Amino acid sequence: RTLIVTTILEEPYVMYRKSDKPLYGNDRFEGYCLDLLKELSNILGFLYDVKLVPDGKYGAQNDKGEWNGMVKELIDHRADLAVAPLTITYVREKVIDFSKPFMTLGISILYRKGTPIDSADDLAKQTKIEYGAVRDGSTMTFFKKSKISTYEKMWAFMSSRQQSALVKNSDEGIQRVLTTDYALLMESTSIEYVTQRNCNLTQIGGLIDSKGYGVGTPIGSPYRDKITIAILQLQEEGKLHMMKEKWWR
Amino acid sequence: RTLIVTTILEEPYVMYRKSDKPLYGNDRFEGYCLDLLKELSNILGFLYDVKLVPDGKYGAQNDKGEWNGMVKELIDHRADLAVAPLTITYVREKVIDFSKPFMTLGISILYRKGTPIDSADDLAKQTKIEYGAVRDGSTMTFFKKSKISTYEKMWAFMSSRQQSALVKNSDEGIQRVLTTDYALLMESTSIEYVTQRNCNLTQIGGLIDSKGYGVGTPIGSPYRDKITIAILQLQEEGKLHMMKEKWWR
Ligand SMILES: O=C(Nn1c(=O)c(=O)[nH]c2cc(C(F)(F)F)c(-n3ccnc3)cc21)c1ccccc1
Ligand SMILES: O=C(Nn1c(=O)c(=O)[nH]c2cc(C(F)(F)F)c(-n3ccnc3)cc21)c1ccccc1
Ligand SMILES: [Cl-]
Ligand SMILES: [Cl-]
Ligand SMILES: [Cl-]
Ligand SMILES: [Cl-]
């Protein structure tokens, strides 16, 4: 009766709820994805038990093609739904089902307000403002693997000089953006979380490498179609915009 | 054997191929969506016959809930696939199947280069630069129906003064952007088509009202899952970026 929902700690999607005493059950967690799960549970009518993915991974394959993370939990039917910022990808779609994306995003540019900079075309042709991405992240992985000429060029730059233009994590990247003449390339959702808290920062340009976060289910699940419908229903009603503004403002 | 593909004339997705003699068959058409259909046909292995939607409509319901356009062709099994910029929506998803989006887009701002303007927040609080959208378009329909406070405010403005801030079509809107102090709100894809041909113009800010174009199929079609996989395959390989750059540059 009670569906098992696998998820992953990820701000502001899933966070431990702050409390003065140890909490139990789903009340331990809060965030955008917990609110989304509550709406889904009230549209389709189901009880749910949230369980963090034991290895804290989204889901990738090792050298032998063995899966891990939330994808493996669905593949092995240890979870009925994955309600998380789980990216819809070619390799994953072949082993699990995805709903239509509840959130769409891409690579954009975090930078200061009031600067001539205005696009990815402009950053690629100057060498004064140091620009890069989080080392070993999805954004960096995109630029490194890209066959698109212009993105190969931006990768050559940010990976030059011992890769000094890169940063270890988003936080260190953020602090580098505020403290020095540095422009960060990362997810538009993450940037939007930054611009709301650092009013001296903005988003420059549009999106590269579009993608979406969807709810994952085991292949053959009856909930895939149901959840897709509910997500689009919520989107049409503006409720997803409400949820996002709540946890990002 | 030969699948029937319903589509719709829409630049640069589907266009009549220019010729000095009358053309026949699929060679009459060209564009992004024809190239996408050719890739799909070579990944999944099928023959196709392109047929323009007889009423030239994407697909909406009349007062009695009766469907038209490409959706009706799929509902009535007069077409096997709809390969077109067909928007994934709640009402449509209930009567047809959609693949994962082959292109994602939203509302953005077309405007001049080198201006203090930098976001939808900035346009909403000034009354000097006249800004609006194409009358009776999806962008206008979004602002008019929105319950989000800030978008209600921008709608009140652009629909004030006998709605003078609005334009009849995109072309007239474009020419208004080049000739006067005017900022246009419309689809990010359409704006991207503009910035490539009017180098004195740029895209301001991010996306509002995210959505995606998907391939439509009749409910219960075996091609939905196949096409989703193929689209993601093409996306991962960078080929969709190649196709878009071809027809937009
Ligand atoms: O784990 C990887 N990526 N990844 C997924 O695969 C996924 O499904 N959802 C993800 C959601 C988020 C976010 F938090 F933004 F919601 C972030 N992320 C974390 C910090 N900046 C962004 C990363 C995701 C990964 C790591 C290294 C190289 C390639 C991929
Ligand atoms: O027909 C309507 N919308 N609409 C769809 O419903 C659809 O599925 N695909 C669409 C694709 C395009 C584009 F060309 F951009 F690819 C455009 N469009 C045309 C000009 N500017 C944008 C409009 C689409 C419509 C008309 C009035 C009010 C509400 C909706
Ligand atoms: Cl295991
Ligand atoms: Cl990712
Ligand atoms: Cl009919
Ligand atoms: Cl639309």
Coordinates of C-alpha atoms and ligand atoms in Angstrom, one line a residue:
Chain A
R1 CA 0.0 0.0 0.0
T2 CA 2.7 2.4 1.1
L3 CA 5.0 3.2 -1.9
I4 CA 8.7 3.4 -1.3
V5 CA 10.2 6.6 -2.6
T6 CA 13.9 6.8 -3.1
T7 CA 15.5 10.2 -3.1
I8 CA 18.8 11.9 -2.4
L9 CA 20.0 14.8 -0.2
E10 CA 20.3 17.8 -2.5
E11 CA 19.6 21.5 -1.7
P12 CA 16.9 22.7 -2.0
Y13 CA 15.2 19.6 -3.3
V14 CA 15.7 17.3 -0.3
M15 CA 17.1 18.5 3.0
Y16 CA 17.1 17.4 6.6
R17 CA 14.5 19.4 8.5
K18 CA 16.0 21.4 11.3
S19 CA 14.8 20.2 14.7
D20 CA 15.7 20.4 18.4
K21 CA 15.0 16.7 18.8
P22 CA 15.6 13.7 16.6
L23 CA 12.9 13.3 14.0
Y24 CA 11.4 10.2 12.5
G25 CA 9.7 9.2 9.2
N26 CA 9.1 11.6 6.3
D27 CA 9.0 14.5 8.7
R28 CA 12.8 14.3 8.8
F29 CA 12.9 15.7 5.3
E30 CA 11.7 18.9 3.6
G31 CA 12.2 20.6 0.3
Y32 CA 10.9 21.1 -3.3
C33 CA 10.8 17.4 -4.0
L34 CA 9.0 16.6 -0.8
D35 CA 6.4 19.1 -1.7
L36 CA 6.1 17.7 -5.2
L37 CA 5.7 14.2 -3.7
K38 CA 2.9 15.4 -1.4
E39 CA 1.0 16.9 -4.4
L40 CA 1.5 13.7 -6.4
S41 CA 0.3 11.7 -3.5
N42 CA -2.9 13.8 -3.2
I43 CA -3.6 13.8 -7.0
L44 CA -3.1 10.1 -7.6
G45 CA -4.0 8.9 -4.1
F46 CA -1.2 6.9 -2.4
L47 CA 0.8 6.6 0.8
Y48 CA 4.5 7.0 0.6
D49 CA 7.6 6.3 2.8
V50 CA 10.7 8.3 1.9
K51 CA 14.0 6.4 2.0
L52 CA 17.4 8.0 1.1
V53 CA 19.3 6.2 -1.6
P54 CA 21.8 4.2 0.6
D55 CA 24.9 5.1 -1.5
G56 CA 23.9 8.7 -2.0
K57 CA 24.2 8.4 -5.8
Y58 CA 21.9 9.4 -8.6
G59 CA 22.7 6.4 -10.8
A60 CA 25.6 5.5 -13.1
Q61 CA 27.2 2.4 -14.5
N62 CA 30.6 1.0 -13.5
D63 CA 33.1 -0.4 -16.0
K64 CA 31.0 -3.7 -16.0
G65 CA 27.7 -2.0 -16.8
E66 CA 26.4 -2.5 -13.3
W67 CA 24.1 0.3 -12.1
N68 CA 24.1 2.1 -8.7
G69 CA 22.2 4.9 -7.0
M70 CA 18.5 5.6 -7.3
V71 CA 18.4 3.9 -10.8
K72 CA 19.5 0.6 -9.2
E73 CA 16.9 0.9 -6.5
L74 CA 14.2 1.2 -9.2
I75 CA 15.8 -1.6 -11.4
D76 CA 15.8 -3.9 -8.3
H77 CA 12.3 -2.9 -7.2
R78 CA 13.5 -1.7 -3.8
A79 CA 11.7 1.6 -4.6
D80 CA 8.5 2.4 -6.4
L81 CA 9.3 6.0 -7.3
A82 CA 12.4 8.2 -7.4
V83 CA 11.3 11.8 -6.6
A84 CA 14.5 13.7 -7.0
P85 CA 16.4 16.0 -9.3
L86 CA 17.1 12.9 -11.4
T87 CA 18.3 13.8 -14.9
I88 CA 16.5 12.2 -17.9
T89 CA 19.3 10.6 -20.0
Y90 CA 19.7 8.1 -22.8
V91 CA 21.5 5.5 -20.8
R92 CA 19.0 5.7 -17.9
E93 CA 15.9 5.7 -20.0
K94 CA 16.8 2.3 -21.3
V95 CA 16.5 0.7 -17.9
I96 CA 14.0 2.8 -16.0
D97 CA 10.9 4.9 -16.9
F98 CA 10.8 8.7 -16.6
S99 CA 7.9 11.0 -16.3
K100 CA 7.9 14.2 -18.4
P101 CA 10.3 16.6 -16.7
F102 CA 9.0 18.5 -13.7
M103 CA 11.9 20.9 -14.1
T104 CA 13.9 21.8 -17.2
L105 CA 17.3 23.4 -17.0
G106 CA 20.6 23.9 -18.8
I107 CA 24.1 25.4 -18.5
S108 CA 24.1 29.1 -18.1
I109 CA 26.5 31.8 -16.8
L110 CA 26.7 33.2 -13.3
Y111 CA 28.4 36.6 -13.2
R112 CA 28.2 40.2 -11.8
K113 CA 25.6 42.8 -12.7
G114 CA 26.2 45.7 -15.0
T115 CA 29.0 44.2 -17.2
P116 CA 29.5 44.2 -21.0
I117 CA 29.3 40.4 -20.8
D118 CA 26.1 39.1 -22.3
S119 CA 26.4 35.5 -23.7
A120 CA 28.6 32.4 -24.1
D121 CA 29.8 33.8 -27.4
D122 CA 31.4 36.8 -25.6
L123 CA 33.1 34.8 -22.9
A124 CA 34.7 32.4 -25.5
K125 CA 36.6 35.2 -27.3
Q126 CA 38.1 37.1 -24.4
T127 CA 40.8 36.0 -22.0
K128 CA 40.6 38.6 -19.2
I129 CA 37.6 37.4 -17.2
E130 CA 38.6 33.9 -15.9
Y131 CA 35.7 31.5 -16.5
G132 CA 35.3 27.8 -15.8
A133 CA 33.0 25.3 -14.0
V134 CA 32.9 23.0 -11.0
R135 CA 35.7 20.4 -11.5
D136 CA 34.3 16.9 -12.4
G137 CA 30.6 18.2 -12.5
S138 CA 28.1 17.7 -15.2
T139 CA 28.8 21.1 -16.7
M140 CA 32.5 20.3 -16.9
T141 CA 31.7 16.8 -18.2
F142 CA 29.6 18.4 -21.0
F143 CA 32.4 20.8 -22.1
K144 CA 35.0 18.1 -22.0
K145 CA 33.1 15.5 -24.0
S146 CA 31.5 18.0 -26.4
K147 CA 32.2 17.6 -30.1
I148 CA 30.7 21.1 -30.9
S149 CA 33.5 23.3 -32.0
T150 CA 32.7 26.3 -29.9
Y151 CA 32.4 24.2 -26.8
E152 CA 35.6 22.4 -27.5
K153 CA 37.2 25.9 -27.6
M154 CA 35.8 26.9 -24.2
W155 CA 36.9 23.6 -22.8
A156 CA 40.4 24.1 -24.1
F157 CA 40.5 27.5 -22.3
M158 CA 39.1 26.5 -18.9
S159 CA 41.2 23.3 -18.8
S160 CA 44.4 25.3 -19.6
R161 CA 47.0 26.5 -17.2
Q162 CA 46.7 23.4 -15.0
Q163 CA 42.9 23.9 -15.1
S164 CA 43.2 26.9 -12.8
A165 CA 39.9 28.3 -14.1
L166 CA 38.0 25.4 -12.5
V167 CA 36.7 25.0 -8.9
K168 CA 36.2 22.1 -6.6
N169 CA 32.5 22.6 -5.8
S170 CA 29.6 25.1 -6.3
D171 CA 30.1 26.8 -3.0
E172 CA 33.8 27.5 -3.6
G173 CA 32.8 28.5 -7.1
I174 CA 30.2 30.9 -5.7
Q175 CA 32.7 32.5 -3.3
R176 CA 35.1 32.8 -6.2
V177 CA 32.5 34.7 -8.2
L178 CA 31.8 37.1 -5.4
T179 CA 35.5 37.7 -4.5
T180 CA 37.3 37.9 -7.8
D181 CA 36.8 38.7 -11.5
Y182 CA 35.4 35.2 -12.2
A183 CA 32.5 33.9 -14.2
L184 CA 30.9 30.5 -13.4
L185 CA 29.3 28.0 -15.8
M186 CA 26.8 25.7 -14.1
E187 CA 23.2 24.6 -14.0
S188 CA 20.6 27.4 -14.5
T189 CA 18.7 26.1 -11.4
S190 CA 21.7 26.4 -9.2
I191 CA 22.5 29.9 -10.6
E192 CA 18.9 30.9 -9.9
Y193 CA 19.4 29.8 -6.3
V194 CA 22.5 32.1 -6.2
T195 CA 21.0 35.2 -7.8
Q196 CA 18.3 35.2 -5.2
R197 CA 20.8 35.3 -2.3
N198 CA 23.5 37.4 -3.9
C199 CA 21.7 40.5 -5.3
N200 CA 25.0 41.6 -6.9
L201 CA 24.9 38.7 -9.3
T202 CA 22.8 37.8 -12.3
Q203 CA 22.3 35.1 -15.0
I204 CA 24.0 35.9 -18.3
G205 CA 22.4 34.6 -21.5
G206 CA 20.4 31.5 -22.2
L207 CA 20.8 27.7 -21.8
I208 CA 23.3 25.3 -23.2
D209 CA 22.8 21.5 -23.0
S210 CA 19.1 21.5 -22.2
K211 CA 17.8 18.7 -19.9
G212 CA 15.1 17.9 -17.5
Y213 CA 14.5 16.4 -14.1
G214 CA 11.9 13.6 -14.1
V215 CA 10.3 11.2 -11.6
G216 CA 11.9 7.8 -12.1
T217 CA 9.9 4.5 -11.9
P218 CA 10.7 0.9 -12.8
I219 CA 10.0 0.0 -16.4
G220 CA 6.4 -1.2 -16.7
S221 CA 5.2 0.9 -13.8
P222 CA 1.5 2.1 -14.0
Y223 CA 2.6 5.4 -12.3
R224 CA 4.6 6.7 -15.2
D225 CA 1.6 7.9 -17.2
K226 CA -0.2 9.0 -14.0
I227 CA 2.7 11.1 -12.8
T228 CA 3.4 12.7 -16.2
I229 CA -0.3 13.8 -16.3
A230 CA -0.1 15.1 -12.7
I231 CA 3.1 17.0 -13.3
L232 CA 1.7 18.7 -16.4
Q233 CA -1.5 19.5 -14.5
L234 CA 0.6 21.1 -11.7
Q235 CA 2.6 23.0 -14.3
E236 CA -0.5 24.4 -16.0
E237 CA -1.9 25.5 -12.7
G238 CA 1.2 27.4 -11.8
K239 CA 1.8 25.3 -8.7
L240 CA 5.3 24.2 -9.8
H241 CA 6.3 27.9 -10.1
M242 CA 4.9 28.4 -6.6
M243 CA 7.0 25.5 -5.3
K244 CA 10.2 26.6 -7.0
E245 CA 9.8 30.2 -5.8
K246 CA 9.3 29.0 -2.3
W247 CA 12.6 27.0 -2.0
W248 CA 14.6 29.4 -4.3
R249 CA 13.6 32.9 -3.2
Chain B
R1 CA 4.6 -0.3 -44.1
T2 CA 4.9 3.4 -44.8
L3 CA 4.0 5.5 -41.8
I4 CA 1.9 8.6 -42.2
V5 CA 3.6 11.6 -40.6
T6 CA 1.3 14.6 -40.0
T7 CA 3.1 18.0 -39.7
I8 CA 2.5 21.7 -40.2
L9 CA 4.2 24.5 -42.1
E10 CA 6.3 26.4 -39.5
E11 CA 9.6 28.1 -40.1
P12 CA 12.3 26.7 -39.8
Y13 CA 10.7 23.4 -38.8
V14 CA 8.8 22.6 -42.0
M15 CA 8.9 24.7 -45.1
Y16 CA 8.2 24.3 -48.8
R17 CA 11.4 23.5 -50.6
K18 CA 12.2 26.2 -53.2
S19 CA 12.2 24.8 -56.7
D20 CA 11.9 25.9 -60.4
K21 CA 9.4 23.1 -61.1
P22 CA 6.5 21.6 -59.1
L23 CA 7.8 19.0 -56.6
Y24 CA 6.2 15.8 -55.4
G25 CA 6.3 13.7 -52.2
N26 CA 8.5 14.4 -49.2
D27 CA 10.9 16.3 -51.4
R28 CA 8.4 19.2 -51.3
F29 CA 9.4 19.9 -47.7
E30 CA 12.5 20.7 -45.8
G31 CA 13.5 21.9 -42.4
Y32 CA 14.5 20.9 -38.9
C33 CA 11.6 18.5 -38.4
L34 CA 12.2 16.9 -41.8
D35 CA 15.8 16.2 -40.8
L36 CA 14.7 14.9 -37.4
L37 CA 12.2 12.6 -39.1
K38 CA 15.0 11.3 -41.4
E39 CA 17.2 10.5 -38.4
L40 CA 14.3 8.8 -36.6
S41 CA 13.5 6.8 -39.7
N42 CA 17.2 5.6 -39.9
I43 CA 17.5 4.7 -36.2
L44 CA 14.2 2.8 -35.9
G45 CA 13.9 1.7 -39.5
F46 CA 10.7 2.8 -41.2
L47 CA 9.4 4.4 -44.4
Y48 CA 7.4 7.6 -44.0
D49 CA 5.0 9.8 -46.1
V50 CA 4.7 13.4 -45.0
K51 CA 1.2 14.9 -45.1
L52 CA 0.4 18.4 -43.9
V53 CA -2.4 18.7 -41.3
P54 CA -5.4 19.6 -43.5
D55 CA -6.6 22.4 -41.3
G56 CA -3.2 23.8 -40.6
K57 CA -3.7 23.6 -36.8
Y58 CA -1.6 22.1 -34.0
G59 CA -4.6 20.8 -32.1
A60 CA -7.1 22.4 -29.7
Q61 CA -10.6 21.7 -28.4
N62 CA -13.7 23.6 -29.4
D63 CA -16.5 24.5 -27.0
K64 CA -17.8 20.9 -27.2
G65 CA -14.4 19.3 -26.4
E66 CA -13.9 18.2 -30.1
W67 CA -10.3 18.1 -31.2
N68 CA -8.7 19.4 -34.4
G69 CA -5.3 19.8 -36.0
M70 CA -2.5 17.3 -35.7
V71 CA -3.9 15.9 -32.4
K72 CA -7.1 14.9 -34.2
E73 CA -5.2 13.2 -37.0
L74 CA -3.5 11.0 -34.3
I75 CA -6.7 10.5 -32.3
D76 CA -8.4 9.3 -35.5
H77 CA -5.5 7.2 -36.6
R78 CA -5.1 9.1 -39.9
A79 CA -1.5 9.6 -39.0
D80 CA 1.1 7.4 -37.2
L81 CA 3.4 10.2 -36.0
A82 CA 3.3 14.0 -35.6
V83 CA 6.8 15.3 -36.2
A84 CA 6.3 19.0 -35.6
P85 CA 6.9 21.7 -33.0
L86 CA 3.9 20.3 -31.1
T87 CA 3.9 21.5 -27.5
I88 CA 3.6 18.9 -24.7
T89 CA 0.5 20.0 -22.7
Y90 CA -1.8 18.6 -20.0
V91 CA -4.9 18.6 -22.2
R92 CA -3.1 16.9 -25.1
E93 CA -1.2 14.3 -23.1
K94 CA -4.6 12.9 -22.1
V95 CA -5.6 11.9 -25.6
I96 CA -2.2 11.3 -27.4
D97 CA 1.2 10.1 -26.5
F98 CA 4.3 12.4 -26.5
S99 CA 7.9 11.5 -26.7
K100 CA 10.3 13.2 -24.4
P101 CA 10.9 16.7 -25.9
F102 CA 13.3 17.0 -28.8
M103 CA 13.5 20.8 -28.0
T104 CA 12.8 22.7 -24.9
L105 CA 12.0 26.4 -24.8
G106 CA 10.3 29.2 -22.8
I107 CA 9.3 32.9 -22.9
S108 CA 12.3 35.2 -23.1
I109 CA 13.0 38.8 -24.0
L110 CA 14.2 40.0 -27.4
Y111 CA 15.9 43.4 -27.2
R112 CA 18.8 45.6 -28.3
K113 CA 22.4 45.0 -27.4
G114 CA 24.3 47.1 -24.8
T115 CA 21.3 48.2 -22.7
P116 CA 20.9 48.4 -18.9
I117 CA 18.0 45.9 -19.3
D118 CA 18.9 42.4 -18.1
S119 CA 15.8 40.5 -16.9
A120 CA 12.0 40.2 -16.7
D121 CA 12.2 41.8 -13.2
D122 CA 13.7 45.0 -14.8
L123 CA 11.1 45.4 -17.6
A124 CA 8.3 45.0 -15.1
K125 CA 9.2 48.1 -13.0
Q126 CA 9.9 50.6 -15.7
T127 CA 7.4 52.3 -18.1
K128 CA 9.8 53.9 -20.6
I129 CA 10.7 50.9 -22.9
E130 CA 7.4 49.7 -24.4
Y131 CA 7.2 45.9 -24.1
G132 CA 4.6 43.4 -25.0
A133 CA 4.0 40.2 -27.1
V134 CA 2.3 38.9 -30.2
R135 CA -1.4 39.5 -29.8
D136 CA -3.3 36.2 -29.3
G137 CA -0.1 34.1 -29.2
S138 CA 1.0 31.6 -26.6
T139 CA 3.2 34.1 -24.9
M140 CA 0.3 36.6 -24.6
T141 CA -2.0 33.8 -23.6
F142 CA 0.4 32.8 -20.8
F143 CA 0.5 36.4 -19.3
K144 CA -3.2 36.9 -19.6
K145 CA -4.1 33.6 -17.9
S146 CA -1.3 33.6 -15.3
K147 CA -2.1 33.7 -11.6
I148 CA 1.5 34.6 -10.7
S149 CA 1.5 38.1 -9.2
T150 CA 4.5 39.4 -11.1
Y151 CA 3.1 38.1 -14.5
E152 CA -0.3 39.5 -13.7
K153 CA 1.5 42.9 -13.3
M154 CA 3.3 42.6 -16.7
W155 CA 0.0 41.6 -18.3
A156 CA -1.8 44.6 -16.9
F157 CA 0.9 46.9 -18.4
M158 CA 1.1 45.4 -21.9
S159 CA -2.7 45.2 -22.2
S160 CA -3.1 48.8 -21.1
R161 CA -3.6 51.8 -23.3
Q162 CA -5.8 49.8 -25.8
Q163 CA -3.1 47.1 -25.7
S164 CA -0.8 49.3 -27.8
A165 CA 2.2 47.4 -26.5
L166 CA 1.1 44.3 -28.4
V167 CA 1.8 43.3 -32.1
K168 CA -0.2 41.3 -34.6
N169 CA 2.5 38.8 -35.5
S170 CA 6.2 37.9 -34.9
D171 CA 7.4 39.6 -38.1
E172 CA 5.6 42.9 -37.2
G173 CA 7.0 42.5 -33.7
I174 CA 10.5 42.0 -35.0
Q175 CA 10.3 45.0 -37.2
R176 CA 9.0 47.0 -34.3
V177 CA 12.0 45.9 -32.2
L178 CA 14.5 47.0 -34.8
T179 CA 12.7 50.4 -35.6
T180 CA 11.6 51.7 -32.2
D181 CA 12.4 51.4 -28.5
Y182 CA 10.4 48.2 -28.0
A183 CA 11.1 44.9 -26.3
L184 CA 9.4 41.7 -27.4
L185 CA 8.4 38.8 -25.2
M186 CA 8.1 35.5 -27.2
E187 CA 9.5 32.0 -27.5
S188 CA 13.2 31.6 -26.9
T189 CA 13.5 29.5 -30.1
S190 CA 12.0 32.3 -32.2
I191 CA 14.2 34.9 -30.5
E192 CA 17.2 32.7 -31.3
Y193 CA 16.2 32.7 -34.9
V194 CA 16.1 36.5 -34.7
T195 CA 19.5 37.1 -32.9
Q196 CA 21.2 35.1 -35.7
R197 CA 19.9 37.4 -38.5
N198 CA 19.8 40.8 -36.6
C199 CA 23.2 41.1 -35.0
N200 CA 22.1 44.3 -33.3
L201 CA 19.7 42.2 -31.1
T202 CA 20.2 39.8 -28.2
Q203 CA 18.3 37.6 -25.8
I204 CA 17.7 39.2 -22.4
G205 CA 17.5 36.9 -19.3
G206 CA 16.3 33.3 -18.9
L207 CA 13.1 31.4 -19.6
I208 CA 9.6 31.8 -18.3
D209 CA 6.9 29.2 -18.8
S210 CA 9.2 26.3 -19.7
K211 CA 7.8 23.7 -22.2
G212 CA 9.0 21.2 -24.8
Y213 CA 8.2 20.1 -28.3
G214 CA 7.6 16.4 -28.6
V215 CA 6.8 13.9 -31.3
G216 CA 3.1 12.9 -31.0
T217 CA 1.7 9.4 -31.5
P218 CA -1.7 7.8 -30.9
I219 CA -2.1 6.4 -27.4
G220 CA -0.8 2.9 -27.2
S221 CA 1.7 3.4 -30.0
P222 CA 4.8 1.2 -29.9
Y223 CA 6.8 4.1 -31.3
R224 CA 6.5 6.4 -28.3
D225 CA 9.2 4.6 -26.3
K226 CA 11.3 4.0 -29.4
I227 CA 11.3 7.7 -30.4
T228 CA 12.0 8.9 -26.9
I229 CA 15.1 6.7 -26.8
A230 CA 16.2 7.9 -30.3
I231 CA 15.7 11.6 -29.4
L232 CA 17.8 11.2 -26.3
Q233 CA 20.4 9.3 -28.3
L234 CA 20.5 12.1 -30.8
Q235 CA 20.7 14.7 -28.0
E236 CA 23.6 12.9 -26.3
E237 CA 25.5 12.7 -29.6
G238 CA 25.1 16.5 -30.2
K239 CA 23.2 15.9 -33.5
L240 CA 20.2 17.9 -32.3
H241 CA 22.5 20.8 -31.7
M242 CA 23.8 20.3 -35.2
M243 CA 20.3 20.3 -36.7
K244 CA 19.3 23.4 -34.8
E245 CA 22.4 25.4 -35.7
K246 CA 21.8 24.5 -39.4
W247 CA 18.3 25.9 -39.6
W248 CA 18.8 28.8 -37.2
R249 CA 22.2 30.2 -38.0
Ligands
LIG1 O1 25.9 13.2 -10.1 C1 26.0 13.8 -11.2 N1 25.1 14.4 -11.9 N2 23.7 14.5 -11.6 C2 22.9 13.5 -12.0 O2 23.3 12.5 -12.7 C3 21.4 13.6 -11.7 O3 20.6 12.8 -12.1 N3 21.0 14.7 -11.0 C4 21.9 15.8 -10.6 C5 21.3 16.9 -9.9 C6 22.2 17.9 -9.4 C7 21.6 19.1 -8.7 F1 22.1 19.2 -7.4 F2 21.8 20.2 -9.3 F3 20.2 19.0 -8.6 C8 23.5 17.8 -9.7 N4 24.4 18.8 -9.2 C9 25.1 18.8 -8.1 C10 25.9 19.9 -8.0 N5 25.7 20.7 -9.1 C11 24.8 20.0 -9.8 C12 24.1 16.7 -10.4 C13 23.2 15.7 -10.9 C14 27.4 13.9 -11.9 C15 28.6 14.1 -11.2 C16 29.8 14.2 -11.9 C17 29.8 14.1 -13.3 C18 28.6 13.9 -14.0 C19 27.4 13.8 -13.3
LIG2 O1 -1.1 27.5 -32.1 C1 -0.8 27.9 -31.0 N1 0.3 27.4 -30.3 N2 1.3 26.5 -30.6 C2 0.9 25.2 -30.3 O2 -0.1 24.8 -29.7 C3 1.9 24.1 -30.6 O3 1.7 22.9 -30.3 N3 3.1 24.5 -31.2 C4 3.4 25.8 -31.6 C5 4.6 26.1 -32.2 C6 4.9 27.4 -32.6 C7 6.3 27.7 -33.3 F1 6.1 28.3 -34.5 F2 7.0 28.6 -32.5 F3 7.0 26.6 -33.4 C8 4.0 28.5 -32.3 N4 4.3 29.8 -32.6 C9 3.9 30.4 -33.8 C10 4.3 31.7 -33.7 N5 5.0 31.9 -32.6 C11 5.0 30.8 -31.9 C12 2.8 28.2 -31.6 C13 2.5 26.9 -31.3 C14 -1.5 28.9 -30.2 C15 -2.0 30.1 -30.8 C16 -2.7 31.0 -30.1 C17 -2.8 30.9 -28.7 C18 -2.3 29.8 -28.0 C19 -1.6 28.8 -28.8
CL3 CL 22.8 -4.5 -4.4
CL4 CL 23.2 15.8 -15.0
CL5 CL -13.0 14.8 -39.2
CL6 CL 2.5 26.6 -27.1

